[PDB]
Structure formats: C-alpha cells, structure tokens
Structure 1
Amino acid sequence: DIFNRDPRDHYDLLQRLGGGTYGEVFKARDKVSGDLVALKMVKMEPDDDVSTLQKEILILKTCRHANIVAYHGSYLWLQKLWICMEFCGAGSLQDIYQVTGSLSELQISYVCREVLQGLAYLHSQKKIHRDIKGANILINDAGEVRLADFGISAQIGATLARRLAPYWMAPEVAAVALKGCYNELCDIWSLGITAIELAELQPPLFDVHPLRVLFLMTKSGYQPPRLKEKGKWSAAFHNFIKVTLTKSPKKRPSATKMLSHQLVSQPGLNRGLILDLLDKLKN
C-alpha cells in the first residue's frame, strides 16, 4: 500500500548517503515525530516495469522482525518512488570496518548470531536474501543488527513470477523455474564468507577476477575457503566456518541449526560489543 503524495510533506531531506544506477539513499527526519528515517529513492519512468520494486516493498512490508530493517511506508510522486525505512546511523559493516579495521571474534560472533536470527525468520516466511555480505548488514546507533538491501531478493522474485509465462518439464528445469536451482541455505554459505570478510577486510579470492572465481567454484575439486591466520582465532570460529562453508547444500546446516552452534550461542554476546566498535568510529 502506497501513499500517492510528495514525501517532502511528511519528511525533511537532510543528507544524500550515496547512489547507484539501481537507487539513491537519503537520510531524512520525520517532520512530526522527529525520528530519523532512511529514504530509498528510485527513478521510475512511465515505460519501465514496476514489478521488481513492488516485490521489494511487499518483502519489507510483510517482514516484521528485530534483525530486519523496519519499513514505514512508501511514496509515489513525480515519477519517483520513495521507500521509507528505519534509520541505521552507523551504516553497514563495510562502511564501519573501512574505518575501524578488522572486527574481533566476539564482535563477529554477535553479528553472526544476529544475522542467523534474521535469516531463520526470512526462511520460515519462505523468503531468501541471496545477497548477504558486510555491505548489506546494517548497524544502528544502539548497536543492533539489521539485514538490508533486498533489491536482488526482489529481482529474482519478480523474475520467478514473470516466469509463469510444466508437465513434460524435467525436474532440474522445474527447480530453476520455481526456485532458481538453489535453496535458502545459500544464505548460510554467504554468512560464512561474510564472517571471513569481517575478520580480514576482504572475502576470499577478492583479488581474483570474478568470472574466474565463478569458474573455480564450479570445478570438481573446489575447496571451501578458510581463515588465513590459524592462531588468531578459536577452534569454535574455525569450525563455524568449516560448517557454514559446507560445499553440499544437502549437508549444510540451516540457520536454526546454526543458532545452536557454540560460537553464536556462547554467553556475553550483545550490542555492547558493537558499541565498542562504534566508539572506534570517532577515534
């Protein structure tokens, strides 16, 4: 459900937070309530198809969970669509680690736990993020963790619907038609890679060409990556990675199963750990 009016009525546009071909992100304040919001602006011309964006909204609107970016509403005005969300002041983990350098095992553990909670919720709702990385895990000024940037999740969903227009079809073809050849457990892998990102400032093979990496991943003898420095981390951390980075999705554990893992179920994991990191931000 979409408000057909100028959002500059309801909000004040403070600051641009960056742009892409895909969208523009604005910091803004609610003129009445006074609370800060994130406003995602998308330039939608009459001719182009709106389904991709409609799917993103529907995902956001239909997700009420702590670890997923809250949605307030959306505004269609002057052929510009504004999606309104809760503000996450510290930004993404990538925005942050660029300044602070590498996170600590416990900070990583807390982040992983929080993402897993979000994923478990998403998967229960039969939704897949499919773009879990540092740059999509947002932090608020309170050190709470929020999953964001469902534009890809929306893009594959909008295609899956577009793909309606079956019996002589082969099972693998059916799987691509319905699910795209993969399942929810892809997110678990991405988390594993993200855990490495946070530890090392780069995912594995970041210096290698992308097309080449795709090739390497499809070879028979592809070994899952590990953490570079054995000694710097605990057995539980190494294992968390070993397990999340299970090559076979038949044998890779679910978000729920992962939440009971030693690393992410240990006590003392809370936002304080992240607050410590955000203090390193003003340093």
Structure 2
Amino acid sequence: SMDVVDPDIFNRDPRDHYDLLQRLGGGTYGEVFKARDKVSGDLVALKMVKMEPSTLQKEILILKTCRHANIVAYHGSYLWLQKLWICMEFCGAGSLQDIYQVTGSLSELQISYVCREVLQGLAYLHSQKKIHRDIKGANILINDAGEVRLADFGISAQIGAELARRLEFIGTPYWMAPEVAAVALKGGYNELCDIWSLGITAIELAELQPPLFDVHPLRVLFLMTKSGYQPPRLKEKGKWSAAFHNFIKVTLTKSPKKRPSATKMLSHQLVSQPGLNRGLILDLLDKLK
C-alpha cells in the first residue's frame, strides 16, 4: 500500500496458490517453471530468481503496468525463503526459438505475422516510455492459439536501475554537451534499438540464428563498431520476396535518426498485407508435431 504502483508481491509460499510442474528452462536470470492455479486449474509460468542474503521490483512493475494482448500477462509474485517467483501468462508452444529448433526456417508469411504482432507490442511499450532491449526469438512466445506475446523485461529493469542510480553520480549538468547529457540520462540511445532487434529476429526466424552467431560476443561488438560496418542481409536472395528484403533493410537502418518507429513500421507492406492471422502459426505448430 505504501507504493505508488503496488508490485503485488505475496510474502508466502507460491505452493499455497499453485501446483509446481516441470522446469521449462533456465539461465543467468534464474529458472522458468510451469505451474497450475489450485482453484481455477489455469496454467501459469513462474520465473524463479534466487536472492542474496529492487531491480526485480522494477521488472515486476514494468510488466504489471503493461496491459496489452502482445505482452505476457502478470498474475502476482511470491517472495519466500530467499526466492522470488514472478507469476505470468503461460505460452503453451514456448518461444519461437523452441519452435524453429524442431521446425526449421519459418515461412515468409509466418515471419510477417510475428513481426506485425511484435511491432504492436513495441508500439505500446514505447508509448509508455518503456524500452524492451532484449528482443529475440527466445523472448517472443507463442500460445496454443498461435498468438504472440513478448516476454522478459530483465534487461529493461537492469537498465532502468542503472540509469536511476547514474543520476546520483553525474553531478551538475550546465556545462555538459548534449551527447554527454544523453549518456548520463538515457544511456546514449533510444527505443529505436528495439526496431533493429526485431529486424535481426526476422533474419533469425528465416535462418535459425542471428547473423555472426558463431563469432565471439566481444568480437561481434568490435565488428559492429568499426567505421565500415554494414547492416546484415538475408543470405539467400531468391527465396524471399522483395517486401521481406525491404523490411529487413529499413528495420536494420544503421542510423537511429532514420530508423522508423514501431507505429511507422506497422504501415510497411510486409506487415500490413491481408493474409496475416494466427492460423499461419497454427500451421507451424502442426509441423512441430
């Protein structure tokens, strides 16, 4: 009650409300488990993080204040015995990475529908002055109806925490050049970084991996910052339509001043075409079986 926006954190065992099912996956953030509501029988995903004896509260708040069909729903969190369990919408088919690893390259129409859906979620997030900063196949989830939901605001919360603390150390601003003020306040970039990530994700869904995937991370950073760096392209030309080649070209615009917003990208031919609906992903899921 003392918070402006209540994060809805229960100081109790999540097993009071849920039946813990299988571990779906894990990483540096912690683990994701499947769970079932003890009264309604509805499925949920629990993201469990091991605590040390505030940035997770920021992640919960980013999620809670989203109320959009293309962003995973929030159902409350449990803080118990040094563990935080964030309860969210369960997406029965997993991530697009989980799917394409069995299925192979998605079709152009299936990629188009996913991009339209991700752009809707992004336009909504950017309208709220939020940035995702971790768009990729593993964070775009698919439910049993073939519908698309964005997940994982972990990096978004880490950046929010970093920028809020940074204000404590910057000192007086009056003599700062505008590019120094941009780093101190915003980290030196804006929400258009998500549009680039979606373009890379479209290549990922078409080629099963992002460009340079087998190059070392620090070397990829080095390659991307060289003066003669050029945005990546789809390897096969003839397989894709000129609209998919162009969608990649404009989302992967090098200069952020010319890279279009999520709202603007929703007018692109590739994502505004009439045959885009969840039925395309239902076809993909049939192939999965």
CA distance in 1, matches of 2:117, 2:199: 13
Stretch deviating more after TM superposition (255-264 or 19-28):
19-28
Deviation at 1:166, TM superposition (A): 2.6
Post-superposition CA distance 1:59-106 (Å, at most 9, x none): 011001000011011111111111000100110000110010010000
- 1:83 is paired with a residue whose SS is strand
Post-superposition CA distance 1:20-54 (Å, at most 9, x none): 232111100000011000001111123xxxx2101
- Matching residue of 2:4: none
Deviation at 1:206, TM superposition (A): 1.3
Deviation at 1:208, TM superposition (A): 2.0
Deviation at 1:187, TM superposition (A): 0.4
Correspondence for 2:156 among 153, 161, 168: 153
- 2:197 is paired with a residue whose SS is helix
Alignment coverage as a number of residue pairs: 278
Say whether 1:182 aligns with 2:197.
no
**Identity of matched residues, %:** 99
Post-superposition CA distance 1:161-210 (Å, at most 9, x none): 11129323332221112111110000000110100000000111112222
Correspondence for 1:70 among 69, 73, 95: 73
- Matching residue of 1:238: 245
Deviation at 1:231, TM superposition (A): 0.6
What is the TM-score when the length of structure 1 is the normalising length?
0.96
Stretch deviating more after TM superposition (182-191 or 163-172):
163-172
CA distance in 1, matches of 2:215, 2:35: 39
Unaligned runs of 5+ in 1: none
CA distance in 2, matches of 1:204, 1:102: 14
Deviation at 1:232, TM superposition (A): 0.3
- 2:198 is paired with a residue whose SS is helix
Stretch deviating more after TM superposition (22-31 or 212-221):
212-221
- 2:146 is paired with a residue whose SS is coil
- 1:162 is paired with a residue whose SS is helix
CA distance in 1, matches of 2:221, 2:78: 39
Stretch deviating more after TM superposition (1-10 or 266-275):
1-10
Deviation at 1:127, TM superposition (A): 0.3
Deviation at 1:149, TM superposition (A): 1.0
CA distance in 1, matches of 2:173, 2:40: 51
CA distance in 2, matches of 1:39, 1:132: 20
CA distance in 2, matches of 1:82, 1:118: 24
CA distance in 2, matches of 1:279, 1:104: 14
Correspondence for 1:204 among 200, 203, 211: 211
- 1:74 is paired with a residue whose SS is strand
- 1:40 is paired with a residue whose SS is strand
- 1:75 is paired with a residue whose SS is strand
- Matching residue of 1:4: 11
Post-superposition CA distance 1:221-262 (Å, at most 9, x none): 111111111110001000001111100001111101100000
CA distance in 2, matches of 1:173, 1:250: 18
What is the TM-score when the length of structure 2 is the normalising length?
0.94
- 1:264 is paired with a residue whose SS is helix
Unaligned runs of 5+ in 2: 1-7
CA distance in 2, matches of 1:205, 1:11: 41
CA distance in 2, matches of 1:261, 1:116: 11
- Matching residue of 1:58: 61
